[PDB]
C-alpha cells in the first residue's frame, strides 16, 4: 500500500485536515496523522481537537512517504513554515521525487522552505500575496493545480477535489472514481 | 448567539461531523461537540480521533439548543439510534419546535426514536431502505431536504450545503452567504 504523512499543527484548518485523511483512508492509503508539536491533541482553527496518530518526531523516522500533506489554516501554515523538522521532511521528499500536497494557506510553507520553486501553484485567495512574495511560483486560480510533484488547492470547499487528486496520483484514476461515488459529490 | 449540540458517537463519519462544527462556528454559532459515551476521545469511522467539548450527559443539562445535529456514519448512527439519552434529547427538541439536523445515515436515528414522522427526508443512498422501513417518511433525492424543523442531507459531499442550510435556518441568508464565500465552494 501507499503511505501518506499528514502534518498536523495548532491552528490547522480541521476541514482541510480531516477530508484528505478520511478520503485517503477510503482509498486504502496508510495515513499517519503526525502532530507537529508532539503526540498531544491538537486544537485546530475552529476549535475541533484532533488526537494525532504519532508525533512528527516519531513519524519522520518511519519515512519515507508517498505523499506529504500540508493542511491549511493561516496559523497552522505559519507553524509549519517555522518548523525545522518540516523543512527537512519536505526537502527530502522533493529530493526523492515524492509527491507534496498542500491546501489553502498550506502552500505558503513550501515558500518558507524553498520547495518547488518555479512550479505553478494555487492557494486560498487570501494567501496569494504571501505565496507570491518574490515571484518564486506562477499563480493559478484552478481549484486544484498539479505541476509534477507539487499538488496544491484552494480551500475547505476544494478539499474533496484535492483529496481525490492525491488518490489519483498514488492509486490511479479507477480507485479515485470508486472512492468518489459513495461521497455524494456534486 | 444561537447554540448547536452536535452528538458525537464512536463510528461517526468525521467529515460529516467536522464540516458542520467548523461552518457553524464560522457563523458565530456556539457549538458544543458532545460525546455520546462520555468525555473521552472518540474514534470516528476512518479512525480520526476527536476530543469532545463535553460529555452528552453534561451537555444535555445545558440545553436547550437551537439545533441538534446528528452526523452520519453507519456505526455512529447505530449508536445514536440505541441511546436513551439521544431519544430524550430529540423528543424534547421536537416538542419545543427546535431544529433537528441529520446527515448521511444520521436520519435513521430519527426513525429509531420516532421523530418527525410524516416528514420529507433524504439520507445517504445506502441508508434509504433502513430509513423507509415502515413508510414513516417520504423520501427525497435532494442534496439537502428541509421539511419544517427536520433538516436532512445525503453524504460527505453534501456536508457544506447541509451546514450552510443550518446556518441559514438559525442566522439567516446573509450570514450564510458571508460564511460561504471564503470556503471556495463550487
Asked if B155 and A25 come within 8 Å (Cβ–Cβ), the reply is no
What single DSSP character describes residue B48? -
**How does DSSP assign B83-148, residue by residue?**
-HHHHHHHHHHHHTT-EEEEETTTTHHHHHTT-STT-EE---GGGHHHHTTTS-SEE--SSEEEET
The residues that bridge with A33 in the sheet, in sequence order, are A6
- Domain range for residue B149? 1-186
In this structure, what CATH number is given to the domain that contains residue B131? Answer: 3.40.50.880
Min Cα–Cα distance to chain A from B181, Å: 10
Q: Active site includes A104? A: yes
A49 CB-side CA count, 13 A: 16
Contact B108, B127 (CB under 8 A): yes
**What residues in chain A have their Cβ under 8 A from chain B's Cβ atoms?**
13-15, 18-19, 21-22, 25-26, 33, 41, 45-51, 124-126, 143, 154-158, 160, 182-186
Q: What number of other Cβ atoms are within 10 A of residue B28's Cβ?
A: 13
Nearest to A25 among B22, B47, B154 (CB): B47
User: What CA–CA distances, in Å, run from B49 to A23, A40, A51, A117, B127?
Assistant: 15, 12, 5, 35, 24
Asked if B156 and A25 come within 8 Å (Cβ–Cβ), the reply is no
Asked if A18 and B160 come within 8 Å (Cβ–Cβ), the reply is no
On chain B, the residues whose CB falls within 8 A of the CB of A13 are 22
- Resolution of the determined structure in angstroms stands at 1.6
Which residue matches cell numbers 507537529?
A36
Q: Active site includes A136? A: no
SS3 B42: strand
User: What CA–CA distances, in Å, run from B177 to A105, B6, B26, B159, B182?
Assistant: 22, 22, 12, 16, 9
SS3 B40: coil
User: CA–CA separation, B186 vs B171, rounded Å?
Assistant: 22
User: CA–CA separation, A159 vs A76, rounded Å?
Assistant: 16
User: CA–CA separation, B168 vs B173, rounded Å?
Assistant: 5
Of A7, A169, A168, the closest CA to residue A87 belongs to A7
Q: What order do you get walking across the sheet with A144-147 strand by strand?
A: A54-55, A30-35, A3-8, A67-70, A99-103, A150-153, A144-147
Q: Tally DSSP H helices, then E strands, for chain A.
A: 8, 11
User: CA–CA separation, B13 vs B148, rounded Å?
Assistant: 25
User: CA–CA separation, B48 vs B56, rounded Å?
Assistant: 20
Spell A14-35 as b/e; 16+ CB within 10 A means b: bbbbbbbbbbbbbbebebbbbb
Burial status of residue B133 (CB atoms within 10 A of its CB: 0-12, 13-18, 19 or more) = exposed
User: CA–CA separation, B75 vs A138, rounded Å?
Assistant: 45
Method: X-ray
Which residue matches cell numbers 452528552?
B56
SS3 A117: coil
Which residue matches cell numbers 468525555?
B39
Q: Tally DSSP H helices, then E strands, for chain B.
A: 8, 11
Nearest to B18 among A18, A25, A33 (CB): A18
What is the count of structural domains for chain B? Answer: 1
Q: Which helix (H) or strand (E) holds B69?
A: strand B67-70
User: What CA–CA distances, in Å, run from A96 to A149, A153, B180?
Assistant: 10, 22, 39
Residue in B48, B107, B124, B125 to test binding to A, most A beta-carbons within 10 Å: B48
User: CA–CA separation, A130 vs A136, rounded Å?
Assistant: 11
User: CA–CA separation, A76 vs B51, rounded Å?
Assistant: 19
On chain A, the residues whose CB falls within 8 A of the CB of B124 are 182, 184
Spell A116-143 as b/e; 16+ CB within 10 A means b: beebbbbbbeebbebbbeeebbeebeeb
User: CA–CA separation, B151 vs B102, rounded Å?
Assistant: 6
Nearest to B160 among A48, A157, A182 (CB): A157
Amino acid at each position: 500500500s501507499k503511505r501518506a504523512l499528514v502534518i498536523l499543527a495548532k491552528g490547522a484548518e480541521e476541514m482541510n485536515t480531516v477530508i484528505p485523511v478520511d478520503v485517503m483512508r477510503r482509498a486504502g492509503i496508510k495515513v499517519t496523522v503526525a502532530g507537529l508539536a508532539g503526540k498531544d491533541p491538537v486544537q485546530c482553527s475552529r476549535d475541533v481537537v484532533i488526537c494525532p496518530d504519532a508525533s512528527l518526531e516519531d513519524a519522520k523516522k518511519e519515512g519515507p512517504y508517498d505523499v506529504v500533506v500540508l493542511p491549511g489554516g493561516n496559523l497552522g501554515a505559519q507553524n509549519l513554515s517555522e518548523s525545522a523538522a518540516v523543512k527537512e521532511i519536505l526537502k527530502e521528499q522533493e529530493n526523492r521525487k515524492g509527491l507534496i500536497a498542500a491546501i489553502c494557506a498550506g502552500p505558503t510553507a513550501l515558500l518558507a522552505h524553498e520547495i518547488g520553486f518555479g512550479s505553478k501553484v494555487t492557494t486560498h485567495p487570501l494567501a496569494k500575496d504571501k505565496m507570491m512574495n518574490g515571484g518564486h511560483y506562477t499563480y493559478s486560480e484552478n481549484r486544484v493545480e498539479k505541476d509534477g510533484l507539487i499538488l496544491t488547492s484552494r480551500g475547505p470547499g476544494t478539499s474533496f477535489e484535492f483529496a481525490l487528486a492525491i488518490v489519483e496520483a498514488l492509486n490511479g484514476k479507477e480507485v479515485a472514481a470508486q472512492v468518489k461515488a459513495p461521497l455524494v459529490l456534486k
